[PDB]
Design a protein around this nucleic acid. Structure first.
Lengths: 52, 98, 116, 166, 158
RNA sequence: UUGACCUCAAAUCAGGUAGGACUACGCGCUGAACAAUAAGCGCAGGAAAAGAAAAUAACCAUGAUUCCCUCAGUAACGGUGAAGCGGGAAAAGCUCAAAUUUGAAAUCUGGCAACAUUUCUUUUGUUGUCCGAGUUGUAAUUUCAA
RNA sequence: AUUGGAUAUGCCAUAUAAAGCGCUUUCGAAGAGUCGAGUUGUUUGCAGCUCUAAAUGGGUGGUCAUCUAA
RNA sequence: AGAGCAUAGCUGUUGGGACCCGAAAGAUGGUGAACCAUCUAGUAGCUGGUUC
RNA sequence: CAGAAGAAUCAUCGAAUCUUUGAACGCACUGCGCCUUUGGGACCAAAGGCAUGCCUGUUUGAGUGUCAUU
């Protein structure tokens, strides 16, 4: 085993922003929240916003 | 606001200024005192054995061999030319004094 | 002979921490000294403008700062650079003048013997 | 005043004055030990311009090395090893003959309070300068290893710097 | 692994520990008391210089400065200072004036020796031909020049 | 002669300092296989070395050194194999020799005396005096940027 | 408790002194068995040997530019 | 009336200790012809093996 | 187990102690000494030191010195 193995992997930024804009978009869909295991069957509204 | 703004350009308008003299460029000038010091020591230390033989060749007037000997001993003509001019300056001065 | 860059996030934070202690030691003054504007010495980049090492002696005298004090108020000196174009003298004298506009100088107490 | 005149009298090393001195001095130096103390430098102006000052803690040792590694660089390694406590400042050619080269090596006493309190020669008391004749940090050491600015003057090749993201 | 590391691991002596690791904590400010008082202990020096009205670097930033919020013929001329954009800069500037105010008496008095020195010259060679009074040597013992004699004349006034 | 000055020695004459160890990093000398390579030898530090151009360049010219990125597997060599440029990190500059202080060796170690001083009764200084060092040159001064 | 760089303030200052900028009808020293040459080893420099210099000179680059070694 | 550039994968190829194991070495430096330690992952077209 | 009840097979730690050896230091490598001081109850014992090179200085003497010197 050699320490100069490839540990860190490059992703273009515009790939990272797309994967995270998509990740933010899918947090507003209640189905993809239950289907991930989140117990939000009584949450008043999605996306859930509070005041400052 | 002190700020460096790099890139693009800053200006195409050019005005050359006649640059001064730097004193490090002044190196190699013949100081009036040190010429006397070098001359006096040249008189005192005498002459090199090879350089003494150059004087006789000049006195005997085989200048062609004198150049050959100095060039062989020193290494290049300009080094040999200066020595010959240095030597012949001695010879004429000794002959007028003595 | 192989080098690894695992300390790359370690070295960057060490540099930031090294900047913060410098700022602590010298509070009012900036962590960086001012540098002049010069042009790269090649046909490829000659139209560019970047930073230099320090301000030449014509850049200090024209701006109105002696060469000895300049080292003390943070203006660095380059005895090797010279001004061949006036636009190079102009871009760096005004660079000094704008710096002395924003430069607060703290007075220092001075020995005052009773006699003279 | 004088070291101007001594500068140009030492520039002519085969003139009669010097050659007559080269024979006289070499004969008496070979009569001595190989490494021996010298009260006053055999070349006062050269020792002066190389750093030597006529004050306590400044020492000079003359050494002959067989002709036929640099000879002057040798003189420094042999003198320093002889005077284990002194730090070697410099070295200069004094004389030579058909079978030997005579070198004088200037040393400094790192403990003498005339030196330790001298603002200009203090740098030699610092342990980083222990035996500069042994590491190659003297003038001839700097030359003999080709150190300097120019175009005429290893592991950076073999290494394989693999950045974190490659 | 090593012998020296391993014998003291087996032994009974306690390890020479040092609880020195304080990650993420910045260097506390000493020096100018004004900026220390207005120095946020959490913000970075680029943030604190900016918040305090000071330039951390007069030279170009080599990177991308933070965007926290969506932000919407002359060699003789002199730049007439820069007004302070913050109170704290004015606090630093005000102290500069007061420190200079205390150190205002830059004129020096005279000691007895140079006092009578200047009277002996003045009452003999008037008060205007300073070059001539520097030319005399019988009274000008130290052989001062005209420039320094005038300085003594001005300094003796007050 | 005296006695100076020079050398020559010795002393359990006072004050010192060197050695061996470590060796990852570092500076040298040196070295065969299979390559400034292992080894061998020598010398150090918390870094070592390097360092304020006898440096580039042919430009609107740059400007101590060191490391990083690129220049580039490029030029060149004949596969070996760089350097300016550029972009970053960091930045700080300096001291001598060569000048007659010559209207005044103004310089300095050591002994002794008190005064102090402390990571410290364990440190490090000053003042005074005496003796030496030094005029074959110790201070100030000046280092080419002048 | 032990120290560090600053501030505040008391006392002491040998200043007859010491600096920067300025103007010059006066000046301006510059590192030799070194550079350099032939030649021989080592790996271009370095090393030995043979000789061995100069003063707008000397090194290096392109009659010019830059630099100022020992 | 330009189609690349960058990342990830797959297979291929060239190096690198290079699928694993196995040929007298040689050299450096030591110990009392012998022996030891390292350079060394020295050398292979070959041998034997290479896993649901 | 013992063991005391400022305990502790404790911590901290700035004071002393730190066997013979080893760069290893009197010569030797077990012995043999030397010198000085301390003393014993002239001699002996103990203690102290007694290794080389080099540097600054002090004293002593000598050189075939150079003089100096009526």
């Amino acid at each position: 085993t050699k320490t100069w193995r490839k540990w860190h992997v490059k992703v273009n930024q515009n790939e990272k922003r797309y994967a995270i804009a998509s990740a933010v978009a899918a947090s507003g869909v209640p189905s993809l929240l239950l289907a991930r295991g989140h117990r939000i069957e009584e949450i008043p509204e999605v996306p859930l916003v509070v005041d400052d | 606001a002190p700020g460096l703004v790099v890139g693009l350009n800053k200006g195409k308008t050019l005005t050359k200024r006649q640059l001064p003299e730097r004193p490090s460029r002044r190196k190699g000038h013949l100081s009036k005192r040190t010429a006397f010091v070098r001359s006096i020591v040249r008189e005192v230390a005498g002459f090199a054995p090879y350089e003494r033989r150059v004087m006789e060749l000049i006195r005997n007037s085989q200048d062609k061999r004198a150049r050959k000997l100095a060039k062989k001993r020193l290494g290049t003509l300009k080094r040999a030319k200066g020595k010959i001019e240095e030597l012949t300056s001695v010879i004429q001065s000794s002959r007028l004094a003595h | 002979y192989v080098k690894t860059w695992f300390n790359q996030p370690g070295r960057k934070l060490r540099r930031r921490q090294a900047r913060q202690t410098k700022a602590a030691k010298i509070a009012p003054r900036p962590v960086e000294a001012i540098r002049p504007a010069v042009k790269p010495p090649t046909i490829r980049y000659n139209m560019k403008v970047r930073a230099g090492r320090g301000f030449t002696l014509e850049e200090l005298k024209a701006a109105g700062v002696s060469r000895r004090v300049a080292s003390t108020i943070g203006i660095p000196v380059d005895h090797r650079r010279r001004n061949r174009s006036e636009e190079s003298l102009q871009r760096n004298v005004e660079r000094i003048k704008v710096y002395l506009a924003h430069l607060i100088v703290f007075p220092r107490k001075a020995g005052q013997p009773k006699k003279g | 005043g004088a070291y101007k005149y001594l500068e140009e009298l030492a520039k002519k090393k085969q003139s009669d004055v010097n050659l007559f001195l080269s024979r006289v001095r070499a004969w008496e130096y070979r009569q001595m030990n190989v490494i021996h103390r010298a009260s006053r430098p055999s070349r006062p102006d050269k020792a002066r311009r190389l750093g030597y000052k006529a004050k306590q803690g400044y020492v000079i040792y003359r050494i002959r090395v067989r002709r036929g590694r640099s000879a002057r660089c040798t003189a420094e390694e042999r003198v320093g090893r002889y005077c284990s406590n002194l730090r070697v400042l410099n070295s200069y050619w004094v004389n030579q003959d058909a079978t030997y080269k005579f070198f004088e090596v200037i040393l400094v006493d790192p403990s003498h309070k005339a030196i330790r309190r001298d603002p200009r020669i203090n740098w030699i008391v610092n342990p980083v300068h222990k035996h500069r004749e042994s590491r190659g940090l003297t003038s001839i050491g700097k030359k003999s290893r080709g150190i300097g600015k120019g175009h005429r003057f290893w592991l950076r090749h073999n290494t394989l710097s693999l950045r974190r993201y490659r | 692994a090593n012998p020296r590391q391993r014998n003291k691991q087996r032994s009974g002596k306690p390890r020479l520990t040092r609880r020195n690791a304080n990650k993420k904590a910045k260097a506390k400010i000493y020096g100018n008391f004004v900026i220390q008082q207005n120095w946020d202990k959490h913000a970075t020096l680029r943030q604190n210089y900016a918040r305090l009205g000071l330039l951390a670097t007069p030279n170009y930033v080599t990177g991308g400065v933070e965007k926290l919020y969506p932000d919407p013929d002359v060699l003789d001329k002199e730049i007439s200072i820069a007004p302070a954009k913050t109170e704290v800069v004015r606090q630093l500037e005000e102290e500069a004036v007061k420190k200079a105010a205390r150190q205002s008496n830059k004129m020096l008095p005279l000691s007895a020796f140079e006092h009578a020195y200047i009277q002996r010259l003045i009452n003999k060679y008037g008060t205007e031909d300073f070059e001539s009074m520097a030319k005399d040597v019988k009274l000008n013992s130290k052989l001062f020049n005209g420039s320094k004699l005038k300085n003594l004349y001005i300094r003796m006034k007050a």
